[PDB]
Amino acid sequence: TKRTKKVGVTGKYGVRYGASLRRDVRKIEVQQHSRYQCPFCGRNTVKRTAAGIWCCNGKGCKKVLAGGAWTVTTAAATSARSTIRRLREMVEV
Amino acid sequence: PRQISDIKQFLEIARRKDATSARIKKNTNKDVKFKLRCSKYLYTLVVADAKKAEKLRQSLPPDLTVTEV
Amino acid sequence: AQRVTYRRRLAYNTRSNKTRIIKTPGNNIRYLHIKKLGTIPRCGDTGVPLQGIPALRPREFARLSHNQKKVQRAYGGCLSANAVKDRIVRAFLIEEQKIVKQKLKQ
Amino acid sequence: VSNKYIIDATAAVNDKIFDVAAFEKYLIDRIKVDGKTGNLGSSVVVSREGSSKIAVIAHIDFSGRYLKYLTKKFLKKHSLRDWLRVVSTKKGVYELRYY
Amino acid sequence: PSHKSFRTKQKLAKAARQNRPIPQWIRLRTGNTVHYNMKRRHWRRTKLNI
RNA sequence: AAUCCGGUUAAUAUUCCGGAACCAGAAGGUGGAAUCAACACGGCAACGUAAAUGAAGUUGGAGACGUCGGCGGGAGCCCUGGGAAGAGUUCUCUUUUCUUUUUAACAAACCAUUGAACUACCCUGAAAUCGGUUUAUCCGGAGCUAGGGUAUGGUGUUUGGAAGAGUUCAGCGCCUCAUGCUGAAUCCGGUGCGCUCUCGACGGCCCUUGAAAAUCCAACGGAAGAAUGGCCUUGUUUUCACAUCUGGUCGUACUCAUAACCGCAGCAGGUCUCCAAGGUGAACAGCCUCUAGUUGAUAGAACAAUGUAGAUAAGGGAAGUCGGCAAAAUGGAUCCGUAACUUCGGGAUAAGGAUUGGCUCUAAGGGUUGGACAACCAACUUAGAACU
Ligand SMILES: [Zn+2]
Numbered sequence: 001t002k003r004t005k006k007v008g009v010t011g012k013y014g015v016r017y018g019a020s021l022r023r024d025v026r027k028i029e030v031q032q033h034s035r036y037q038c039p040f041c042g043r044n045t046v047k048r049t050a051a052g053i054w055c056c057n058g059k060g061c062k063k064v065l066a067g068g069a070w071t072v073t074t075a076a077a078t079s080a081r082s083t084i085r086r087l088r089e090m091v092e093v
Numbered sequence: 094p095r096q097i098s099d100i101k102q103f104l105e106i107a108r109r110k111d112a113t114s115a116r117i118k119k120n121t122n123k124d125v126k127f128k129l130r131c132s133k134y135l136y137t138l139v140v141a142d143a144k145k146a147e148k149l150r151q152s153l154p155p156d157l158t159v160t161e162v
Numbered sequence: 163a164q165r166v167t168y169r170r171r172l173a174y175n176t177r178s179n180k181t182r183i184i185k186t187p188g189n190n191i192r193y194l195h196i197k198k199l200g201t202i203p204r205c206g207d208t209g210v211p212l213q214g215i216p217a218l219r220p221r222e223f224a225r226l227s228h229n230q231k232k233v234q235r236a237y238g239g240c241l242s243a244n245a246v247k248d249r250i251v252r253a254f255l256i257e258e259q260k261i262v263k264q265k266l267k268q
Numbered sequence: 269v270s271n272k273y274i275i276d277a278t279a280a281v282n283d284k285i286f287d288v289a290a291f292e293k294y295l296i297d298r299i300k301v302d303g304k305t306g307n308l309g310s311s312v313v314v315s316r317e318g319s320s321k322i323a324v325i326a327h328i329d330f331s332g333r334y335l336k337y338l339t340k341k342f343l344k345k346h347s348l349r350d351w352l353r354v355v356s357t358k359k360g361v362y363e364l365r366y367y
Numbered sequence: 368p369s370h371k372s373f374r375t376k377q378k379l380a381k382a383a384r385q386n387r388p389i390p391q392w393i394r395l396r397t398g399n400t401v402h403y404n405m406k407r408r409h410w411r412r413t414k415l416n417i
Numbered sequence: 418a419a420u421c422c423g424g425u426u427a428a429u430a431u432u433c434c435g436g437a438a439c440c441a442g443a444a445g446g447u448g449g450a451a452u453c454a455a456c457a458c459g460g461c462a463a464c465g466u467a468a469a470u471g472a473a474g475u476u477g478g479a480g481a482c483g484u485c486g487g488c489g490g491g492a493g494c495c496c497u498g499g500g501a502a503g504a505g506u507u508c509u510c511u512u513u514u515c516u517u518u519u520u521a522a523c524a525a526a527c528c529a530u531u532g533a534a535c536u537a538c539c540c541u542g543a544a545a546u547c548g549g550u551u552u553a554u555c556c557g558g559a560g561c562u563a564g565g566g567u568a569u570g571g572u573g574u575u576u577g578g579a580a581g582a583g584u585u586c587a588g589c590g591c592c593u594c595a596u597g598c599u600g601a602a603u604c605c606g607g608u609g610c611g612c613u614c615u616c617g618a619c620g621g622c623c624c625u626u627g628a629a630a631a632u633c634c635a636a637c638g639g640a641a642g643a644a645u646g647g648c649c650u651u652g653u654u655u656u657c658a659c660a661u662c663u664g665g666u667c668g669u670a671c672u673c674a675u676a677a678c679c680g681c682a683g684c685a686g687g688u689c690u691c692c693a694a695g696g697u698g699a700a701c702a703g704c705c706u707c708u709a710g711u712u713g714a715u716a717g718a719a720c721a722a723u724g725u726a727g728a729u730a731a732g733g734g735a736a737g738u739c740g741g742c743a744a745a746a747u748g749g750a751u752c753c754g755u756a757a758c759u760u761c762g763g764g765a766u767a768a769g770g771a772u773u774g775g776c777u778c779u780a781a782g783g784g785u786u787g788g789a790c791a792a793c794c795a796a797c798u799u800a801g802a803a804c805u
Pocket residue numbers: 038039040041042043056060061062
């Protein structure tokens with residue numbers, strides 16, 4: 001059963017706080033409570049702890065990543081990484 | 094309290110200087126408990142055979158103080 | 163049934179007021195104050211508990227013999243076997259990389 | 269598998285207060301095996317009288333407490349209570365005293 | 368509260384000693400009019416205030 | 418850093434007595450090991466041992482940590498089937514009803530057996546027709562399933578402590594005295610969405626991520642050490658075992674409250690917290706009961722008016738009153754059914770209907786089991802039928 005037409009994870013909030021605010025929170029929490037792939041282990045086991053820290057379990061690669069508030073990587077950081085990569089190559093060459 | 098199961102070890106610990114008193118306890122199940130009061134621990138040996146108990150008593154150091162409770 | 167009281171003047175359910183019910187050889191149900199559970203030492207590189215070491219309070223380790231507080235291996239009782247093996251391999255490989263770097267420089 | 273429960277009433281038999289003859293029939297008609305009280309067939313509890321010691325022989329691991337309970341039932345039926353009391357002396361042996 | 372300091376216990380001892388009935392001979396002393404005393408303190412009437 | 422049991426006073430008990438332990442500090446009698454030369458061995462590994470040299474310096478760990486929810490294990494309690502001892506009831510019946518049937522700290526050996534991880538790690542091996550697996554969806558070519566091991570180990574098991582204690586019952590001294598003596602039993606089983614505490618593996622939540630220090634342990638590292646006429650003799654081993662001495666000072670009575678605190682008081686007020694039996698019942702609800710406690714709230718006589726508190730009342734049903742104030746009415750559970758509106762989540766227990774006792778049965782849903790069968794034991798539910 002679908003159990004929810006559109007609210008989804010925000011069904012715990014009942015009818016309060018407003019529809020637009022609930023929708024924005026729904027998108028954020030969907031991003032927040034998502035398993036991501038470790039860029040060093042290749043396993044979909046990365047989970048968030050305390051708004052900016054992402055860890056994946058297992059026997060190996062117990063690394064702790066510094067990421068975004070609810071996503072492992074943000075668009076601005078990716079753009080900055082590309083810009084810094086470009087600048088470093090120009091300086092080296 | 095510590096329990097011993099070796100007859101010769103009990104005899105050695107009885108011949109040891111710190112061994113002062115020995116107690117004989119007879120139970121209703123035909124078992125005899127030999128309890129040695131050392132400085133730190135009370136050592137208990139359980140014997141099920143009266144024939145072996147008699148020889149154990151004979152081989153015990155006569156200079157040791159042994160009482161029956 | 164029988165009801166129990168604290169045997170000390172601490173009247174609150176604190177972490178230092180842990181109690182266990184015992185039945186004495188007088189048909190008496192009463193409390194017995196006990197200490198907190200011990201902790202197994204953790205690995206310094208991965209944080210995993212160390213195998214072969216008992217869980218005790220920090221002061222209780224002073225009464226144990228030396229071999230009960232460690233493992234017969236390099237970094238025994240401070241690092242796990244996997245951590246020690248990784249350090250050995252990493253050390254050897256990097257020293258080899260230094261040697262080949264010097265040789266290629268010359 | 270056999271038991272030899274004994275009840276002694278020498279305190280009242282020699283005093284001519286106890287009726288072992290009626291005690292025989294009381295036990296026979298009130299001993300219950302498998303629910304009903306008429307399951308006596310000589311392969312089960314048997315009763316025997318010696319004019320001073322009533323004997324109950326059993327083969328189905330009988331209980332002496334039930335025997336004492338029936339003795340108290342007979343005591344109250346004959347109104348001999350407050351003068352005679354059943355006590356236990358040996359294993360499976362009960363006796364009546366005056367107290 | 369059964370958990371008292373040494374100073375508190377000594378003060379309680381002093382208060383207890385300064386609560387006994389007055390011997391009559393001192394009151395009968397010539398030129399001494401001690402007689403009755405209102406200094407007597409009851410635990411349920413006047414508190415010591417530490 | 419380290420204590421338990423039993424007993425004892427008129428009043429103190431983890432403090433006294435009896436028994437049995439533990440910790441810290443100080444000094445230092447053995448002893449095995451190894452050395453005719455250096456500071457032990459075993460396991461393919463996880464790792465293990467009776468010791469198995471270790472100065473600084475450095476590093477790591479313990480101390481040391483939130484909250485909620487479900488699951489599994491243990492201890493105590495609750496419940497239950499027998500046996501034993503005593504007591505209650507007995508017009509009648511009740512192999513009946515009630516009380517007891519106990520094993521502390523500490524020490525040793527096992528510990529998934531007997532109950533409970535595949536919990537962590539290691540070895541063989543290489544897996545798609547992918548497999549394993551929890552109540553709950555996680556794991557695996559960064560090495561699955563499977564087989565075999567290693568560690569974590571008590572509130573688990575067998576013992577010592579320890580029956581000599583305690584409990585129950587039954588006799589003899591009978592002025593009995595230091596209260597003495599002589600007898601027995603204290604046994605065998607089971608159960609669970611049960612209660613309290615605790616432990617283990619998990620899951621969820623945070624723009625909330627949930628102290629510090631004293632103190633203890635471990636590691637890297639190598640400072641320092643001196644036996645030799647193949648045999649007496651010393652340095653380590655007192656992080657092995659055993660043995661000796663010491664552990665000072667302060668508090669410890671009692672109330673903790675409808676009489677020991679505060680409120681002017683022996684004031685219906687206020688004041689933090691621990692343990693929590695049985696039945697009915699979802700339940701720590703209400704009601705009755707067991708252990709324990711109390712029967713303490715100036716008393717006697719009679720029911721006048723008006724009061725305070727609790728109830729009822731024919732017919733009408735808010736006509737009362739500013740106002741349905743107050744009271745009444747509804748109420749648990751199961752089965753049908755549930756509108757407008759809406760932020761789609763709700764409204765909603767909407768509204769509105771039916772049933773509910775007792776007794777005798779039937780059907781289904783689960784656990785070891787003798788030669789696809791199957792002899793019992795031990796369990797709670799759900800649904801239906803007849804009768805009354
Ligand atoms: Zn990873």
